[PDB]
Amino acid sequence: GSPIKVGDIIPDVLVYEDVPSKSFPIHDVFRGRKGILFSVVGAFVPGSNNHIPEYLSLYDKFKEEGYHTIACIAVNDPFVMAAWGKTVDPEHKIRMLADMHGEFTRALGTELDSSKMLGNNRSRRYAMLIDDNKIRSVSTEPDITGLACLLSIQRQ
Amino acid sequence: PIKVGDIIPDVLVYEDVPSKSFPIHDVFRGRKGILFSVVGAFVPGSNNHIPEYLSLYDKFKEEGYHTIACIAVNDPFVMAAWGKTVDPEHKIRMLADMHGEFTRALGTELDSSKMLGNNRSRRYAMLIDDNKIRSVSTEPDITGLACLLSIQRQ
């Protein structure tokens, strides 16, 4: 995947949620609306819950601006992803998207060289603002906090 | 496939964190134990039998089978977190065959890439004595009770 860029349409690939039989194009999540898409290296991987608490705390602020649709994506199977999501987000404010084959991550160009540590290649951390499947803003470490996310929204 | 009397594959597995790895032979060296697989942490069915093993744990110990290990093709962070939810007292060793190396060597790989992203392990339960297989069982004979009965047939 080439360097991501504002104005680009996100890769139109299938992701999974809850169970392997429930898959759908990621475009379904952001079609006709604004939202936030951010990644973690993996469910239960240290660091994966570093930012979720701030996203959750800012939910009504995101919602004020039409960004109540928030999705977390990781290269995991959906059983693991869903179980993890319930532990970090009991009110289910965040859609937990399992990029199970790493297809979205590869298409986006955000593969991590993590096979030695985790068995396969996971995603690097990013956070993006999306509008009808187009990228409005892109951030990477260290600008991947909840706050970082809100300020970008407000600049609009 | 796997046969009684064969030695289990001498490969690394992981436990808790990626930096904690060891030959799986360390788990059963010089002792009796139980090794059983699940398709994955949090996969439906993966907690069908753990409650049975835990209920029979003291009986297994009376029989000299103190070492009980669950193995899955998962990273160790996920495996350990899952283990804590199904076995909070940590009676069972939770082994992460993260690369699927043990599973492939044993010949128990499942064609599961479309359902789960990669190839996982078929379900089995084995009795081990100093890394030698003394009994092997596959579905549906992978309950706690089946394990106890296998032990008592030894």
Short mmCIF file of all heavy atoms in Angstrom, two decimals, chain B residues 128-151:
data_model
loop_
_atom_site.label_atom_id
_atom_site.label_comp_id
_atom_site.label_asym_id
_atom_site.label_seq_id
_atom_site.Cartn_x
_atom_site.Cartn_y
_atom_site.Cartn_z
N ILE B 128 0.81 -38.00 28.33
CA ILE B 128 2.23 -37.91 28.05
C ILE B 128 2.96 -38.43 29.28
O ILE B 128 2.52 -38.22 30.40
CB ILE B 128 2.63 -36.43 27.82
CG1 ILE B 128 1.75 -35.82 26.73
CG2 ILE B 128 4.09 -36.33 27.48
CD1 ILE B 128 1.94 -36.40 25.45
N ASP B 129 4.06 -39.13 29.05
CA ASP B 129 4.95 -39.58 30.11
C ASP B 129 6.37 -39.33 29.61
O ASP B 129 6.82 -39.95 28.66
CB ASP B 129 4.71 -41.07 30.40
CG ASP B 129 5.53 -41.58 31.58
OD1 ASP B 129 6.49 -40.89 32.00
OD2 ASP B 129 5.20 -42.66 32.09
N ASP B 130 7.04 -38.34 30.19
CA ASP B 130 8.41 -38.00 29.78
C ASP B 130 8.49 -37.78 28.27
O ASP B 130 9.41 -38.26 27.60
CB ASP B 130 9.39 -39.12 30.22
CG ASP B 130 10.83 -38.74 30.01
OD1 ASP B 130 11.18 -37.55 30.10
OD2 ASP B 130 11.63 -39.66 29.77
N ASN B 131 7.52 -37.02 27.77
CA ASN B 131 7.41 -36.59 26.38
C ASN B 131 7.05 -37.67 25.37
O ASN B 131 6.93 -37.39 24.17
CB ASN B 131 8.62 -35.76 25.96
CG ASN B 131 8.69 -34.50 26.74
OD1 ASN B 131 7.71 -33.74 26.77
ND2 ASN B 131 9.80 -34.27 27.42
N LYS B 132 6.75 -38.86 25.87
CA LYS B 132 6.25 -39.94 25.05
C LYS B 132 4.73 -40.00 25.17
O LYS B 132 4.17 -39.86 26.26
CB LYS B 132 6.88 -41.26 25.50
CG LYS B 132 6.58 -42.44 24.62
CD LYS B 132 7.23 -43.70 25.22
CE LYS B 132 7.28 -44.86 24.23
NZ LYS B 132 8.41 -44.75 23.26
N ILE B 133 4.06 -40.23 24.04
CA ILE B 133 2.60 -40.31 24.01
C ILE B 133 2.14 -41.67 24.53
O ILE B 133 2.58 -42.72 24.04
CB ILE B 133 2.10 -40.10 22.58
CG1 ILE B 133 2.50 -38.71 22.09
CG2 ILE B 133 0.61 -40.27 22.52
CD1 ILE B 133 2.18 -38.47 20.64
N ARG B 134 1.29 -41.66 25.55
CA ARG B 134 0.76 -42.92 26.10
C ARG B 134 -0.69 -43.18 25.70
O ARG B 134 -1.19 -44.32 25.78
CB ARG B 134 0.86 -42.89 27.62
CG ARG B 134 2.28 -42.84 28.10
CD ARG B 134 2.39 -43.01 29.60
NE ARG B 134 1.93 -44.32 30.05
CZ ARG B 134 2.02 -44.73 31.31
NH1 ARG B 134 2.55 -43.94 32.23
NH2 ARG B 134 1.58 -45.94 31.65
N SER B 135 -1.38 -42.13 25.29
CA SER B 135 -2.75 -42.22 24.84
C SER B 135 -3.03 -41.02 23.94
O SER B 135 -2.51 -39.93 24.20
CB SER B 135 -3.69 -42.22 26.05
OG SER B 135 -5.03 -42.41 25.66
N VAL B 136 -3.85 -41.22 22.92
CA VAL B 136 -4.32 -40.13 22.08
C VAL B 136 -5.81 -40.28 21.80
O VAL B 136 -6.27 -41.36 21.45
CB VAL B 136 -3.61 -40.07 20.71
CG1 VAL B 136 -3.98 -38.78 19.98
CG2 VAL B 136 -2.12 -40.19 20.89
N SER B 137 -6.54 -39.19 21.98
CA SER B 137 -7.98 -39.16 21.73
C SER B 137 -8.34 -37.94 20.92
O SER B 137 -7.74 -36.88 21.09
CB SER B 137 -8.75 -39.13 23.05
OG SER B 137 -8.41 -40.25 23.85
N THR B 138 -9.33 -38.09 20.05
CA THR B 138 -9.87 -36.97 19.27
C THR B 138 -11.37 -36.91 19.49
O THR B 138 -11.93 -37.74 20.21
CB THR B 138 -9.52 -37.11 17.79
OG1 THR B 138 -10.01 -38.36 17.30
CG2 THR B 138 -8.01 -37.05 17.60
N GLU B 139 -12.02 -35.93 18.87
CA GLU B 139 -13.45 -35.71 19.08
C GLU B 139 -14.22 -36.99 18.81
O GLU B 139 -13.91 -37.71 17.87
CB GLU B 139 -13.97 -34.61 18.15
CG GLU B 139 -13.73 -33.18 18.64
CD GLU B 139 -14.76 -32.73 19.65
OE1 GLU B 139 -15.17 -33.55 20.51
OE2 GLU B 139 -15.16 -31.55 19.61
N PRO B 140 -15.24 -37.27 19.63
CA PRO B 140 -15.78 -36.48 20.74
C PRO B 140 -15.16 -36.84 22.09
O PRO B 140 -15.58 -36.32 23.11
CB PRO B 140 -17.26 -36.89 20.74
CG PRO B 140 -17.23 -38.31 20.30
CD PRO B 140 -16.11 -38.41 19.29
N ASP B 141 -14.18 -37.73 22.06
CA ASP B 141 -13.62 -38.32 23.27
C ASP B 141 -12.55 -37.45 23.92
O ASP B 141 -11.46 -37.91 24.24
CB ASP B 141 -13.03 -39.69 22.90
CG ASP B 141 -13.56 -40.80 23.75
OD1 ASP B 141 -14.49 -40.56 24.55
OD2 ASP B 141 -13.06 -41.93 23.61
N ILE B 142 -12.90 -36.18 24.14
CA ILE B 142 -11.95 -35.18 24.64
C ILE B 142 -12.52 -34.46 25.84
O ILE B 142 -12.16 -33.31 26.15
CB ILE B 142 -11.59 -34.17 23.52
CG1 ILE B 142 -12.86 -33.50 22.95
CG2 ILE B 142 -10.77 -34.86 22.43
CD1 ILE B 142 -12.55 -32.26 22.07
N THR B 143 -13.40 -35.15 26.56
CA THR B 143 -13.94 -34.66 27.82
C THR B 143 -12.97 -34.92 28.99
O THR B 143 -12.02 -35.71 28.88
CB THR B 143 -15.24 -35.38 28.15
OG1 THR B 143 -14.96 -36.78 28.25
CG2 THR B 143 -16.31 -35.13 27.06
N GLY B 144 -13.23 -34.29 30.12
CA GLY B 144 -12.48 -34.58 31.33
C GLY B 144 -12.58 -36.04 31.70
O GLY B 144 -11.59 -36.68 32.05
N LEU B 145 -13.80 -36.57 31.63
CA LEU B 145 -14.03 -37.95 31.99
C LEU B 145 -13.24 -38.89 31.09
O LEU B 145 -12.65 -39.86 31.57
CB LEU B 145 -15.53 -38.28 31.96
CG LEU B 145 -15.89 -39.77 32.10
CD1 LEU B 145 -15.45 -40.32 33.44
CD2 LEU B 145 -17.39 -39.92 31.92
N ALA B 146 -13.22 -38.63 29.79
CA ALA B 146 -12.49 -39.50 28.88
C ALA B 146 -11.02 -39.53 29.29
O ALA B 146 -10.34 -40.56 29.23
CB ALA B 146 -12.63 -39.02 27.44
N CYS B 147 -10.52 -38.38 29.68
CA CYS B 147 -9.13 -38.32 30.12
C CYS B 147 -8.90 -39.16 31.37
O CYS B 147 -7.95 -39.95 31.45
CB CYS B 147 -8.78 -36.86 30.41
SG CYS B 147 -7.07 -36.55 30.84
N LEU B 148 -9.79 -39.04 32.34
CA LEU B 148 -9.66 -39.85 33.54
C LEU B 148 -9.68 -41.35 33.22
O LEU B 148 -8.88 -42.13 33.75
CB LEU B 148 -10.77 -39.53 34.52
CG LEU B 148 -10.72 -40.36 35.81
CD1 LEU B 148 -9.42 -40.10 36.59
CD2 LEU B 148 -11.95 -40.09 36.68
N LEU B 149 -10.60 -41.76 32.37
CA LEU B 149 -10.69 -43.16 32.01
C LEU B 149 -9.42 -43.60 31.29
O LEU B 149 -8.93 -44.69 31.54
CB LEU B 149 -11.91 -43.39 31.12
CG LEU B 149 -13.25 -43.09 31.78
CD1 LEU B 149 -14.37 -43.33 30.78
CD2 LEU B 149 -13.43 -43.95 33.01
N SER B 150 -8.86 -42.76 30.40
CA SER B 150 -7.58 -43.13 29.77
C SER B 150 -6.47 -43.32 30.80
O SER B 150 -5.66 -44.25 30.72
CB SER B 150 -7.14 -42.08 28.76
OG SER B 150 -8.04 -42.05 27.67
N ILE B 151 -6.42 -42.43 31.78
CA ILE B 151 -5.42 -42.54 32.83
C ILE B 151 -5.56 -43.87 33.56
O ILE B 151 -4.57 -44.57 33.84
CB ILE B 151 -5.54 -41.36 33.82
CG1 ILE B 151 -5.06 -40.07 33.16
CG2 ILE B 151 -4.81 -41.68 35.12
CD1 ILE B 151 -5.42 -38.82 33.91
#
